[PDB]
A paper describes a structure:
Here, we have developed a cell-free protein crystallization (CFPC) method, which involves direct protein crystallization using cell-free protein synthesis. We have succeeded in determining crystal structures of two types of proteins with high-resolution using CFPC. The polyhedra crystal (PhC) produced in insect cells by infection of cypovirus (cytoplasmic polyhedrosis virus, CPV) is one of the most highly studied in-cell protein crystals. The structure of crystalline inclusion protein A ([name]), a bacterial in-cell crystal, had not been previously reported.
Crystalline inclusion protein A ([name]), a hydrophobic protein of 104 amino acid residues, spontaneously forms crystalline aggregates in [name] luminescens, an entomopathogenic bacterium. Its native function is postulated to be involved in nematode symbiosis or pathogenesis. Since we found that twin crystals are formed when [name] is expressed in E. coli, we applied CFPC to [name] with the addition of twin crystal inhibitors during the crystallization process and succeeded in obtaining suitable crystals and determining the structure of [name] at a 2.11 Å resolution. X-ray diffraction experiments of the crystals showed that CipAC_CF crystallized in the presence of 3 v/v % 1,4-dioxane dramatically reduces the twin fraction to 0.10, with a resolution of 2.11 Å. The structure was determined by the molecular replacement method using the search model created by AF231 via ColabFold35. The structure of the [name] monomer consists of the N-terminal arm followed by three β-strands β1, β2, β3, α-helix, and β-strands β4 and β5. Except for the N-terminal arm, the globular domain is a typical oligonucleotide/oligosaccharide-binding (OB) fold. In the crystal lattice, the four α-helices from each monomer form a four-helix bundle around the crystallographic fourfold symmetry axis and exist as a tetramer. This tetramer is consistent with the results of PISA36 prediction of oligomeric states and is considered the basic unit of crystal growth. CipAC_CF forms a multilayer structure composed of the tetramers as the building blocks.
Residue numbers in the entry:
A (entry chain A), B (entry chain A), C (entry chain A), D (entry chain A): 4 to 11, 20 to 104
């Protein structure tokens, strides 16, 4: 039982770029920098046309614009476009 | 009749974490710190797939990223996942 | 023909509170402070369930959280809940 | 192969105004200032009622409120309202 104000699969990272391209197969590509120095290009598990994709898209965007560390998890397989898929994001004050 | 610029169920709190997990039963879990020191885990009254859930999700997120105090009210019962449900948020400049 | 970086119905104002209450008849009530000192409570022209209401809801929220002056116009009649309805918002860098 | 934290059709610009007007033919007009000093008024490729239009609308808005440079591409033709249409936005931390 920790301090009320202290928080506490999920890797810590920074969201360093997002390219929104709803004309194309990727739809939106997220560039992520992990805490151990590796940089990875990733997609969202859901279509942007689905509200679940919109919700994941928004927390990632806010994390980039606030310059925040976040934690993410992915489905765990590279797809036919060459990227893993983000399916969970955690953000804290 | 108060100063034009002065504002004025609803408890004052801070939104200290949000975990967006649209694969799972909770969908999104909000960690809230009340002004009297108690910390509580909460859900939204509406599905994320519904625009009302999206609207509550956005004001909470903005409150976390701006480091703002807000006021919330809940439906008033713990559900089968162990959490109350947020149904109203008020935010001020 | 003005400087490329210089911008330029619409009244200038600040968005000083927003109360998101999708359980109730108002859905979301916006408290607005006009530049001449009068303060007014206002609704949105569109349902929150409609994407046009969502779009107006988002620019207002961003204006509150960034502490920005904006310009708004309304439909021009008080409705049966006692408020006018915002139908246009302009925001500038 | 560049530094992990270093990023890298698309023109660099600032988003200096947005006018959200879902009553009218334009729906939302974006004023953009390119790096070479020319200023241009632009629309979105998608309807605001479509989630793809909402996604492009949000990254533009965040870019304005964070005072960020971004890159955009357009469809490449002036339409019957006198404007080109934005179809891709890239934003970086």
């Amino acid at each position: 039982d920790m301090h009320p104000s202290l928080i506490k699969m999920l890797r810590s990272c920074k969201i360093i770029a997002m390219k929104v391209m709803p004309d194309k197969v990727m739809q939106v590509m997220v560039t992520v920098l992990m805490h151990d120095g590796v940089c990875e290009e990733m997609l969202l598990k859901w279509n942007l046309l689905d509200n679940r994709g919109m919700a994941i898209y928004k927390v990632l965007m806010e994390a980039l614009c606030a310059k925040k560390d976040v934690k993410i998890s992915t489905v765990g397989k590279v797809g036919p476009l060459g990227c893993d898929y983000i399916n969970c994001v955690e953000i804290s004050m």
